[PDB]
Structure formats: structure tokens, C-alpha cells
Design a protein that fits this description.
Shape: globular
PDB class: secretion protein
Assembly: monomeric
Radius of gyration: 14 Å
Protein name: Type VI secretion system baseplate subunit TssK
Distance between the termini: 7 Å
Keywords: T6SS TssK, nanobody, secretion protein
Helix content: 10-25%
Entry title: Structure of TssK C-terminal domain from E. coli T6SS
Structural class: alpha+beta
Largest sheet: 5 strands, antiparallel
Length: about 130
């Protein structure tokens, strides 16, 4: 299907993407493409527990509020034609109803990548449904 590349802006440990593309509210599933100085098998194993989705809409005075209902799952491949990377690891974002709605309504998504992941680089893709 059609693939929408979502530009992620890195600000230290945080990665932020704008979700204002109108096509995203019509049905989309998201994937992360990850490259790191960390060995590939280790990144596959640890990235789903190290990377945390941030709250796209928290209005509290608490810093670093997380978005619950985001399960990062390692995948063999993204089900769409995307730039190939021999050394990259791919992950699906298994979003709950509330998580998907929270990001789409806020028009934003954020991801925390700790320094333990090393020299990490993230790319976010959405595959539009039907």
C-alpha cells in the first residue's frame, strides 16, 4: 500500500514526529526503522524495552510522561516498499485504541531512546490501510 515517511526530529534522547497528514486518520499502522552501534541481535532483543513512547498530550507539570498502550514488536520486514538497510532492525508499533487516538488527536508522537542504545537513529513509516 502507500507509505508515509514521518520525519523525526531528534532533541537529545527524544524523537518527535508531526502527524498532521490527513490520510493518517483514515487507517494507518506504524513502524520504526532503527540503526545503532549496538549489535543487531541485541538491538532486536532490547529496543522494545528501552524505547518508550512519550505522551503526545499530557498537560501535567510532570516531566517525561509516557503514553501507555504502545507495544514495540520486532518484525521480519515492513509490509511495504521502503528503502533497504542491511544493518537496520524493524519494529511495529502495536497501538491500543486510546494510544492511536491520543497521538492522532494531538497531531504528534514522541519516542525516548536512552543513551544505552548507543548512536541510535530512528525513522518512522506509516502504511495506509485500504
Amino acid at each position: 500500500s502507500r507509505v508515509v515517511f514521518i520525519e523525526l526530529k531528534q532533541k537529545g534522547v527524544m524523537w518527535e514526529g508531526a502527524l498532521h497528514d490527513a490520510r493518517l486518520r483514515e487507517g494507518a499502522d506504524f513502524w520504526l526503522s532503527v540503526r545503532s552501534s549496538m549489535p543487531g541481535h541485541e538491538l532486536q532483543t532490547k529496543f522494545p524495552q528501552l524505547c518508550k513512547a512519550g505522551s503526545p498530550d499530557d498537560v501535567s507539570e510532570v516531566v517525561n510522561v509516557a503514553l501507555s498502550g504502545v507495544i514495540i514488536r520486532p518484525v521480519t520486514h515492513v509490509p511495504a516498499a521502503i528503502p533497504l538497510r542491511l544493518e537496520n532492525q524493524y519494529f511495529a508499533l502495536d497501538l491500543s485504541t486510546d494510544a492511536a487516538r491520543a497521538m492522532l488527536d494531538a497531531g504528534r508522537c514522541t519516542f525516548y531512546t536512552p543513551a544505552s542504545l548507543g548512536d541510535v537513529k530512528l525513522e518512522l513509516f506509516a502504511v495506509l490501510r485500504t
